Amino acid sequence: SRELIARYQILLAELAAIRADIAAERTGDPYVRKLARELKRLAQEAAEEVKRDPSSSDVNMALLLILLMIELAVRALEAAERTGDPEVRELAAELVWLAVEAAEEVQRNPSSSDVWLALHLIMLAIWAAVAALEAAERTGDPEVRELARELVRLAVEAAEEVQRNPSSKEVYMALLLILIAILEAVLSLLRAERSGDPEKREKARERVREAVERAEE
Amino acid sequence: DSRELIARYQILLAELAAIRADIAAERTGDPYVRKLARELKRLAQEAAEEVKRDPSSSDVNMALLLILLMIELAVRALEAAERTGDPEVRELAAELVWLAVEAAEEVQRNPSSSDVWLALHLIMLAIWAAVAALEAAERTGDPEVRELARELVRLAVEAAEEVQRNPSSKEVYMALLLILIAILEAVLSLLRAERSGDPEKREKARERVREAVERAEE
């Protein structure tokens, strides 16, 4: 039972390390390259912690989230590259750097629920950020592209505060508020994608503008 | 409340999952994939609606979160299984997604049951493994490997049906987990040979996948 889960998680970790390695080889950006090798290091260290001592559920939960964050973060860096936009790449990279820092904290303190939750919210931030930046590249409207950048910049700043103060509930909630704004913006761009008029274009723009103003509070 | 913020967030996640499912329903080109993507859309809308009517039940909120995440995964899995161009890859992924839809309905009907939640969760993990196997096999163009990967996934479909239909059996749960372990060992063998240079590594990868199928079938 527990033996089976441990075998399974070691395989997931070995696979996450290869996925990170592959992305490290494919990328054209030195920051992405550095981070993909860090994600690879983390998956390897996880496989080796589970190997030595599979019997701690704290450690198993800590290492499982790190593995899932890696899988997500690698796909997130690859998707952010697929846009060809250097600023998209750099924003995704700053969020992945924060996730790696929050993973290190989880590794050092696997019994802390606040530290685990901080990494977990940063993984959700990465997911939202990549959705926003991908939706914005499909529009080719320059103002929408800039507003989506503005939203993601706010998320980076708020994810840094969470990473550095995982037990603050107001800081945690400030990030959640920005993710809500980001998804409201994504949902407005998608509903415009599947519609007709440039009336819908300016409608979508106004909703994204309103989302950024909400986040800015 | 913090709960109020989480509920707002999950309603948006659900709205977004419904659109992703719709988009995949429109693009596909296989009628079974189309039918399933519309079911994944329906499940996301019903989840948005249940959180709206009552955000206060932690069982309901957990039941609905897993469904949304399964939808996100299942849609990417059907899309990835179509990108192979192979009608059998398509059909195997579809059978697993159909099982996940059935297991989601059971979760909706019984959100307080831990066994039923875990059954949906293991089937979502099965979908993840199955697509990794079928994608790695498409990379190789070796006909035997592609056939062994199909055999592994067919075993997972059969074992996922048994989990779906008997969520409280521990032996059946473990039987699926054992198959997923075999599938990941096979994926790991294919990717490690995809990297290497030694052209004997193809036959080495093949023999490790053969051994993985043997373990699964036990």
Residue numbers in the entry:
A (entry chain B): 2 to 218
B (entry chain A): 1 to 218
Quote the study on this structure.
The X-ray crystal structure of SP1 was solved in the ZnPPaM-bound state to 2.0 Å resolution, revealing a special pair geometry closely matching that of purple photosynthetic bacteria. The r.m.s.d. between the ZnPPaM dimer in the SP1 crystal structure and its design model is 0.25 Å. Hydrogen bonds to the ring E ketone group, which has been shown to be important for modulating special pair redox potentials, form with Gln10 in both ZnPPaM molecules, in agreement with the design model. Calculations on the SP1−ZnPPaM dimer crystal structure yielded a lower excitonic coupling of 87 cm−1. Experimental low-temperature spectra of SP1−ZnPPaM in 40% glycerol showed only a modest broadening of the SP1−ZnPPaM dimer fluorescence emission band compared with the monomer, consistent with weaker excitonic coupling. SP1 exhibits weaker excitonic coupling than SP2 and the BChl special pair of purple photosynthetic bacteria, despite its close structural similarity to the latter. We found that the signs of the CD Cotton effects predicted from the crystal structures of SP1 and SP2 were consistent with the experimental signs in the Qy region.
To investigate the photophysics of special pairs independently of the complexities of native photosynthetic proteins, and as a first step toward creating synthetic photosystems for new energy conversion technologies, we designed C2-symmetric proteins that hold two chlorophyll molecules in closely juxtaposed arrangements. We describe de novo-designed proteins that hold Chl dimers in precisely defined, closely juxtaposed geometries.
